[PDB]
Amino acid sequence: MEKEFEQIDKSGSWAAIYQDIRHEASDFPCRVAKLPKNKNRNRYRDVSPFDHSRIKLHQEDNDYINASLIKMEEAQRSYILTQGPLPNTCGHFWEMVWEQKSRGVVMLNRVMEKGSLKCAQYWPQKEEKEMIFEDTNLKLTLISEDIKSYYTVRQLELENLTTQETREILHFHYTTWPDFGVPESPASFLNFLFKVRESGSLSPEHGPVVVHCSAGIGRSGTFCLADTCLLLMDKRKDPSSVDIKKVLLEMRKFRMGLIQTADQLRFSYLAVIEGAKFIMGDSSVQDQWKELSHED
Ligand SMILES: O=C1C[C@@H](c2ccc(C[C@H](NC(=O)C(F)(F)F)c3nc4cc(C(F)(F)F)ccc4[nH]3)cc2)S(=O)(=O)N1
Ligand SMILES: [Mg+2]
Incomplete structure (x- = not known):
């Protein structure tokens, strides 16, 4: 991941790497989201939840909400991603x-x-x-x-x-x-x-x-x-085995467009590589992040 990161930086291929993910991303129907009666429940016409992973409200009138259940099976963690x-x-x-x-x-x-x-x-x-x-x-x-x-x-x-x-x-x-x-x-x-x-x-x-x-x-x-990558590193007890592009593709099976620019992808690598230090046992890096963040 780190050497792949530097390899991509050296050749300036973040855009190419990101476009490949976009091209390879899953495409599933979003019929419910696109129903006329649900138009006013969507903030953006081009951002909809897939029918297979959408969250259903427990109400008879209309159970639709623009929200998706991202169920990461191997990592054993689920997130609900929704629009504002x-x-x-x-x-x-x-x-x-x-x-x-x-x-x-x-x-x-x-x-x-x-x-x-x-x-x-x-x-x-x-x-x-x-x-x-x-x-x-x-x-x-x-x-x-x-x-x-x-x-x-x-x-x-x-x-x-x-x-x-x-x-x-x-x-x-x-x-x-x-x-x-x-x-x-x-x-x-x-x-x-x-x-x-x-x-x-x-x-x-x-x-x-x-x-x-x-x-x-x-x-x-x-x-x-x-979060999922870091979780997966510990879950497998093998941080070097985590392929961030593959993890992103897995997440995109549950909701379209996750990670919207090549630079957000690049930052993801940066955050995961730095976060791997804590996974690898460094019990001081957490306090360092706090200091470097200047939250006070
Ligand atoms: O970092 C981010 C991007 C945001 C985001 C806001 C709105 C949209 C949907 C919006 N739809 C709409 O505006 C509309 F419904 F289609 F009109 C949207 N903004 C866009 C800009 C470009 C860009 F590359 F040119 F920047 C391309 C496609 C776009 N789709 C997507 C992501 S976020 O809240 O998901 N966090
Ligand atoms: Mg007050």
Whole structure:
């Protein structure tokens, strides 16, 4: 991976490598997503979930939500990748979180980027102004927030108003990841990923973590590809055996377009190679990522 990385850098073939993945990527139908009645549930006409892996809402009216279950069998971890919710799909979004029993939500975009709306304000910004999604019978309250320089971690309480059951949902918000861009450095990305891991949100005891950006494929795909590769390195107890391009193709069987630019692919290599140090036993690299990230 490292020598393949340098080989690609030397010859400047990141674009060629990335285009090959695009050409080889799976193509499955997205009939449900394309139904006329679901047009207002899709943020982008060219980003849809495959029918075979789409998440179904547990409601009779219309069970559609632009979200995909990325089930990585060998690594033993599943993620739900979804688009940033629209003003009319925020209730659907939390219904999915509730039904799929997710413990964490990872957001990699901002509500507004470069002057345009990319995601609805689907969570409460203030403790005293909780949100009620009447269409879904759910209530969401901000309990507390831990604000860092480039990301914020929020504690939310989600309540099923019908049963009165409540659950704590952790919200991991990366606020400086530019659209179609990459994190400031491998260290800041890994420090964030390990914060999510240490929280317990990715544990198989919970439902799949929900990951999203604006379309739920570029930044979200980068986040999941790095996490799955690192997980696979330890799962196999053989880090050098992990082929990142093959892992990306496997993930693309579940949702189209994961990793949206050749540079995000390049960053993925960088993050995984650096992350492999922790897998290889370096018990000091984690604290180094934290320092290099300047989260204070
Ligand atoms: O890093 C990223 C890219 C974002 C992204 C936003 C929106 C779309 C769909 C959008 N659709 C639409 O805008 C529309 F529905 F088709 F009009 C979209 N933006 C595009 C830009 C180019 C580019 F190469 F020229 F940059 C090519 C195709 C594009 N599709 C895809 C990815 S993300 O939220 O997935 N993270
Ligand atoms: Mg206040």
